[PDB]
Amino acid sequence: RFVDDYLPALLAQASQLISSEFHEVARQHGFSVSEWRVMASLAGSEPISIGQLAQVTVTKQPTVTRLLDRMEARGQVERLPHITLVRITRKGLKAVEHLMELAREHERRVLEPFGLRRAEELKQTLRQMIDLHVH
Amino acid sequence: RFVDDYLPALLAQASQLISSEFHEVARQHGFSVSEWRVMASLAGSEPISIGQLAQVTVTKQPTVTRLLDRMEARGQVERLPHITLVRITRKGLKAVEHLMELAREHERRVLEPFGLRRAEELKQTLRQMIDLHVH
Ligand SMILES: O=C(O)COc1ccc(Cl)cc1Cl
Ligand SMILES: O=C(O)COc1ccc(Cl)cc1Cl
């Protein structure tokens, strides 16, 4: 059966199942999916361009720009001129840091049955595939 | 940097990049993303329930039901009573079979740099993760 062993279907299914688990936690802490992705990807980061943020959050750039409008109004991010750069503020970092700890715990739980070797292999393969296909 | 080594972000990014590549081909052959997922997941399948189809196509069930309304009007799928089951028709199979060959070729190209061992390891890990987290 094709779908059972077709890589893009496996990636899409695994991604949605794991993400859906953590999105429940994120919402219980006041975060939408997009807010979580933006703050977690900016935490501990130099300012990056709106285009880089859209890439790493897997979000269309027009959508990211409207999201940053409201996140900047809430004091959680700041846009700055170099192209437009964006950074997390201290308020945003304090808003997200506990949730990031919870995300690490959940990821640990997802990966523990597989063992350190298989978990690192998976992450390295995914990183290599991303770097080969990103524009 | 958190996002660089956080499994759900890696899965979401790799999934979107690989899928976006094949979706260009699919549209050039007349298929939307959802139409492609439905027909490719039903090809060579016993009839399955709408809920199973929603799961394997990573699509919300209300959306799948409206999609099947129009795909059934086009003669490409058929809904049948057991719960509602759904199957691909011969017309649908003939519509999608070439695109499935192209999808296999694209997947081969994505996986070839990694070698057979790493490619099979990735697919087995993804399958195991899906089976551990699906409801
Ligand atoms: O939403 C999810 O569960 C996975 O996607 C992400 C999660 C965290 C970050 Cl920082 C970036 C992305 Cl794309
Ligand atoms: O759309 C994509 O590129 C990947 O998602 C799929 C692809 C094919 C099938 Cl059959 C099922 C799914 Cl979820």
Numbering used by the authors:
A (entry chain A), B (entry chain A): 10 to 91, 97 to 149
Give sentences copied directly from the paper behind this entry.
We characterize the binding of IAA to MarR-family regulators from both iac and iad loci. Most characterized MarR-family regulators function as repressors by binding to an operator sequence upstream of the genes they control. When a relevant ligand binds the MarR repressor, it releases from DNA, allowing gene expression. The structures of MarRs from representatives of each auxin degradation operon type establish that each has distinct IAA-binding pockets.
We recombinantly produced the two MarR proteins from the auxin degradation locus of V. paradoxus CL14, MarR_73 (IadR) and MarR_50 (IadR2), and employed isothermal titration calorimetry to determine their binding affinities for IAA, other auxins and related aromatic compounds. Eleven additional auxin and aromatic ligands were examined, with ten exhibiting lower affinities for MarR_73 than that of IAA. MarR_73 structures complexed with nine other auxins were also determined and refined to 1.35–1.6 Å resolution. The MarR_73 structures resolved in complexes with other auxins revealed that the positions of ligand-contacting regions remained unchanged upon the binding of auxins, with the exceptions of the His-32 imidazole ring, which shifted by up to 2.9 Å, and the Arg-46 guanidinium group, which shifted by up to 4.2 Å. In both cases, these shifts accommodated differences in the carboxylate-containing substituent groups of the auxins examined.
